[PDB]
């Protein structure tokens, strides 16, 4: 039926409705730190989120998304391996049922408790919908989450999850500053990839930060209380909403640090 993360509609079944699932530049991938190529040509990342305007938080049945106003260059990403300006449109997470799994990308086979994805689209295409049809249409900033000390800047997100427990529920979520979710260092790995959920379009320039952010056990536990199902339906906990690593194929992962 509809795609998901269950036993009968999970990642291994996606190729039936979305053939590109077996494409040449699919994500996520395992980042082999000893095979990654240091590129001194790579520029530092430029993250300008001071004028960010968050609007709403939504449970879309696959994860929860915090949406931003992308009608102007309020929150943008530039520099790094990017050519042009990319506007932040939304961010969401992927997490597991246990602290030992949850991230989509892995580092030397290591899985993190969760992974944060900040999605941006290339302004030259005018349109998020137009951007996903281009090889350089999107730029996604990936950040790993490890369990340890609590992340203060994440609590506002955690506290509102009760109001969007089921699929289709949304809540006003204004005044949220995404800068509180960034690690200290902006060193990164980058490679050409795809969206990790259907339609799995190969329009993403992935920028994965080396430094993970730490969140508390209680914070992640609250993520696990969400539901894949809609209100009134049998409860299915929203956990393990991650896609496993895909073949790197003919791609090179570059590092901004040595
Ligand atoms: Zn994602």
From Swiss-Prot:
GO molecular function, one term: cyanamide hydratase activity
Matches recorded under Gene3D superfamilies: Alpha carbonic anhydrase
Modified residues (Phosphoserine): 163, 170
Positions of the record's site feature: Involved in the binding of some activators, including histamine and L-histidine: 90
Reactions catalysed, as given in the entry: hydrogencarbonate + H(+) = CO2 + H2O; urea = cyanamide + H2O
Function text: Catalyzes the reversible hydration of carbon dioxide. Can also hydrate cyanamide to urea. Stimulates the chloride-bicarbonate exchange activity of SLC26A6. Essential for bone resorption and osteoclast differentiation. Involved in the regulation of fluid secretion into the anterior chamber of the eye. Contributes to intracellular pH regulation in the duodenal upper villous epithelium during proton-coupled peptide absorption.
Protein name: Carbonic anhydrase 2
Gene encoding the protein: CA2
């Amino acid at each position: 039926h509809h795609w998901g993360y269950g036993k009968h509609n999970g990642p291994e079944h996606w190729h039936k409705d979305f053939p590109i699932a077996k494409g040449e530049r699919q994500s996520p991938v395992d980042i082999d730190t000893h095979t990654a190529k240091y590129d001194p040509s790579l520029k530092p990342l430029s993250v300008s989120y001071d004028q960010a305007t968050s609007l709403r938080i939504l449970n879309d049945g696959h994860a929860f998304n915090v949406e931003f106003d992308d009608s102007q260059d309020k929150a943008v990403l530039k520099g790094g391996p990017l050519d042009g300006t990319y506007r932040l449109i939304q961010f969401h997470f992927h997490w597991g049922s246990l602290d030992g799994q949850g991230s989509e990308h892995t580092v030397d086979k290591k899985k993190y408790a969760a992974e944060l994805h900040l999605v941006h689209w290339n302004t030259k295409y005018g349109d998020f919908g137009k951007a996903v049809q281009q090889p350089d249409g999107l730029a996604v900033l990936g950040i790993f989450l490890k369990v340890g000390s609590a992340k203060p800047g994440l609590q506002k997100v955690v506290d509102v999850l009760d109001s969007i427990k089921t699929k289709g529920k949304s809540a006003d979520f204004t005044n949220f500053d995404p800068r509180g979710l960034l690690p200290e260092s902006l060193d990164y790995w980058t490679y050409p990839g795809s969206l990790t959920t259907p339609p799995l379009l190969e329009c993403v320039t992935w920028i994965v930060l080396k430094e993970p952010i730490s969140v508390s056990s209680e914070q992640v536990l609250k993520f696990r209380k969400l539901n894949f199902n809609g209100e009134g339906e049998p409860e299915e906990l929203m956990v393990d909403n991650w896609r496993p690593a895909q073949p790197l194929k003919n791609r090179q992962i570059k590092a901004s640090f040595k």
